[PDB]
Ligand binder design. Structure first.
Ligand SMILES: Nc1ncnc2c1ncn2[C@@H]1O[C@H](COP(=O)(O)OP(=O)(O)NP(=O)(O)O)[C@@H](O)[C@H]1O
Lengths: 371, 346, 75
């Protein structure tokens, strides 16, 4: 029997089977319904498009995003996203597969129950479990104590974890993530003179970001190299055939993580967030958090991020302090990977929430078996 | 059944966990045959009173006398683990959750049994024995929370007033609280539960800063070496002596009253609940000051028999702590498997 | 300002102070004049235990105000 692992994380959902080292399905967390009724005619009681097919038809559809900040907000839409992942992306009967699911930090109590009611009542799984995204990411690096920085599409989180437990008094949420960066890249490339302003143009910039942006080790130094050399300018072939060139924009976009002001945001950068998070913990565990900063997600996926963070936290931490940033190359799907390891561990078989338990105790059973 | 064997594999397992886990396994497998009704009621009473030695023995003298209806494979591990069980005052986490839950129950109870008439009467006794620098309590007590805020203000009488009383103790002189100033730390955990400890999600409290207190392991005969089953919050309470000065005045002025035992118990009981909930102290950190014979002499002469907050059903709390200990311990088991898997792929 | 601090004996420490000064600052001035350890100190005004972080201004402690000092006994 195979267990399913679904990371409903921010904008992109990662699903697949436990044991595998990669998800089989990744797709946007997007639901659209017809804008006008004339398009439902003769379409067999279908009413909805979910995921990729909803992005292709955004012209004929009104799109809704249920988990833009990692917290589910529309449960009617989230059921359709889950139907789509079980029946269409995975091509599986969820009643045959125990399902490990994933939740943001500081997820409100009501939401864990609702998730559990739907997973059991609507899809009729035999077992289920809920883990915190950042904790699984720690597990995928073989740790149970550290501080994870989880950053995907719409939300960034610094999560101190001690012995498998996310410390609720030090969790910090940053409302600056991948999609805030793709928009800045557009702005600054439009300021050079190449125009990116339509929804189809955003998607182009999202590719140039993922393929050509990196994190400078010293912002000021790299700017100098750019203005005094061409070594770093790179070229990109556009869909029309046009070749645009990318200069200092390649590193000025991910700089917004350490310098959020570039976007009109007065909050602090992902390095000071890490410090601040670590300072809301007992000094008696900080040594362990410093030595185990784990980077996680699609926004952590820029060349040179780990070297940079090491240098920034080294400048905020005490002098005598072993600082280690861990940022695997598979770091984009590190949550999902933690899920697959956990769900395929022998001892976790005893740790599922069973259909029997759900019928006996109701959706609140989630609070007693999933910390 | 397999789960419990995996939980008994925990290195951190304490006397509390064993009692909780073992009774959990005895209650599932045996079911609710009423013959055993009493064993279960009795174990829970022994647990509350921290008589772990009697309960582990009774538990083991029940697993052998019913092995036919039990797994003898599991009884084996229970008996091997038992002689090695300790309790760690700095890490008695399952009990820290139990007492925190019990305190909320004790309050719910006295809220359903109290005309807060005793507390309105105590105000006169407080004003009499209060220091010149304490505020007179003038308002009337209508809520139980106002009754809490009143009794928890008797701490202004501390370090003066209660000194003739504290000085007659032989127990308090073995308090183990370190003078070291460690400041405060953030926490979202209720009661005497520790800040970095794992918790149920419907058992959090809004984040506030809480006191970091350290044990002085050099105190010869220290309370925490003497009562390792008590969780260390702040060692012994000397504000308990302060309640005593006020209580002595009250008993003196209401001796003729026929319902005085009921009333003094309501105060002792709200004080005990409040101290755990507020995180100030653990239960035995307060009860083990009050039970000292010199202070109990004050109650015996007034013919007041304290119940010390003992209720009739600690059942809900006992059960929620079983869920907590299974959770903690398969968690630990699971963490041991993962680590091993990564050490074989490293 | 000139505040007054009163020991359980009744004795009166007179101090020179500013509304700027914190409670931590005040206890230090007591250690300088009387030698009483800051950590041994518990200052009281308006019936309220006085916290170190706040300022004499945050506590309506003005000129000629009288404070009560209690010293802690512990092991
Ligand atoms: N004097 C006090 N006043 C208020 N709250 C206190 C006090 N002492 C302890 N606490 C509470 O104790 C709770 C948890 O801390 P606690 O778990 O007692 O420390 P600890 O880490 O176990 N110390 P140790 O026994 O040395 O490991 C917090 O919620 C605090 O509010």
């Amino acid at each position: 029997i195979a267990a399913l692992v679904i990371d409903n994380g921010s904008g992109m959902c990662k699903a697949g089977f436990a044991g595998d080292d990669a998800p089989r399905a990744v797709f946007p967390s997007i639901v659209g319904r017809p804008r006008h009724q004339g398009v439902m005619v003769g379409m067999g009681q279908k009413d909805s498009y979910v995921g990729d097919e909803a992005q292709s038809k955004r012209g004929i559809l009104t799109l809704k995003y249920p988990i833009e900040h990692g917290i589910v907000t529309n449960w009617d839409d989230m059921e359709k996203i889950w139907h789509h992942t079980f029946y269409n992306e995975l091509r599986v009967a969820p009643e045959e597969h125990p399902v490990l699911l994933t939740e943001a930090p500081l997820n409100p109590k009501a939401n864990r129950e609702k998730m559990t009611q739907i997973m059991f009542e609507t899809f009729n799984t035999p077992a289920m479990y809920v883990a915190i995204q950042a904790v699984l990411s720690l597990y995928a690096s073989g740790r149970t104590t550290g501080i994870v920085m989880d950053s995907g599409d719409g939300v960034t989180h610094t999560v101190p974890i001690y012995e498998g437990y996310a410390l609720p008094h030090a969790i910090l949420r940053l409302d600056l993530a991948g999609r805030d960066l793709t928009d800045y890249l557009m702005k600054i490339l439009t300021e050079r003179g190449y125009s990116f302003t339509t929804t189809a143009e955003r998607e182009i910039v999202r590719d140039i970001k993922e393929k050509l942006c990196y994190v400078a080790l010293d912002f000021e130094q790299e700017m100098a190299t750019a203005a005094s050399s061409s070594s770093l300018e790179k070229s990109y072939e556009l869909p029309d055939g046009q070749v645009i060139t990318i200069g200092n924009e390649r590193f000025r976009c991910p700089e917004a993580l350490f310098q959020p002001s570039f976007l009109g945001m007065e909050s602090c950068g992902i390095h000071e967030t890490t410090f601040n998070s670590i300072m809301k913990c007992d000094v008696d565990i900080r040594k362990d958090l410093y030595a185990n900063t784990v980077l996680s997600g699609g926004t952590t996926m820029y060349p040179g991020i780990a070297d940079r963070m090491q240098k920034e936290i080294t400048a905020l931490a005490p002098s005598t302090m072993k600082i280690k940033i861990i940022a695997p190359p598979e770091r984009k799907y590190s949550v999902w990977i933690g899920g697959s390891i956990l769900a395929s561990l022998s001892t976790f078989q005893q740790m599922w929430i069973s259909k029997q338990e759900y019928d006996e105790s109701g959706p609140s059973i989630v609070h007693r078996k999933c910390f | 059944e397999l789960s419990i064997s995996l939980s008994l594999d925990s290195p951190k397992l304490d006397e509390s966990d064993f009692i909780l886990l073992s009774v959990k396994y005895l209650e599932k497998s045996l079911g609710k045959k009423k013959e055993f009704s009493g064993f279960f009621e009795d174990i829970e009473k022994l647990y509350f009173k921290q008589n772990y030695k009697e309960a582990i023995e009774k538990i083991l003298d029940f697993c052998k006398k019913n092995e036919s209806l039990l797994s003898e494979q599991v009884v084996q591990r229970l008996a091997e683990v038992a002689p090695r069980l300790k309790s760690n005052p700095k890490d008695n986490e399952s009990r820290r959750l139990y007492e925190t839950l019990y305190a909320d129950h004790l309050e719910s109870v006295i809220k359903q049994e109290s005309d807060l008439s005793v507390f309105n009467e105590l105000r006169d006794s407080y004003n009499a024995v209060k220091p010149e620098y304490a505020v007179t309590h003038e308002t009337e007590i209508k809520t139980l929370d106002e009754a809490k805020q009143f009794i928890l203000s008797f701490v202004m009488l501390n370090d003066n007033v209660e000194l003739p009383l504290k000085a007659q103790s032989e127990r308090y002189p073995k308090k183990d609280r370190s003078r070291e100033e460690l400041g405060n730390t953030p926490s979202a955990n209720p009661g005497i539960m520790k800040p970095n400890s794992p918790n149920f999600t419907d058992n959090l409290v809004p984040v506030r800063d809480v006191p970091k207190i350290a044990i002085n392991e050099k105190v010869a005969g220290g309370y925490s070496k003497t009562k390792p089953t008590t969780p260390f919050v702040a060692s012994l309470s000397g504000t308990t002596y302060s309640l005593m000065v006020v209580l002595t005045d009250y008993i003196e002025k209401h001796k003729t009253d026929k319902d005085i035992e009921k009333k003094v118990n309501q105060i002792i009981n709200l004080w005990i609940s409040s101290y755990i909930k507020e995180g100030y102290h653990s239960y035995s950190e307060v009860v083990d000051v009050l039970t000292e014979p010199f202070l109990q002499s004050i109650f015996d002469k007034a013919n007041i028999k304290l119940n010390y907050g003992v209720l009739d059903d600690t059942h809900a709390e006992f059960r929620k702590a079983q869920d907590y200990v299974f959770g903690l311990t398969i968690q630990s088991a699971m963490h041991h498997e993962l680590q091993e898997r990564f050490k074989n792929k490293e | 300002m000139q505040i007054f601090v009163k020991t359980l004996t009744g004795k009166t420490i007179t101090l020179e102070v500013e509304p700027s000064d914190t409670i931590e600052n005040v206890k230090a001035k007591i250690q300088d004049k009387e030698g009483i350890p800051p950590d041994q100190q518990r200052l009281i005004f308006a019936g309220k235990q006085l916290e170190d972080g706040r300022t004499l201004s945050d506590y309506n402690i003005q000129k000629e105000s009288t404070l009560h000092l209690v010293l802690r006994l512990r092991g």
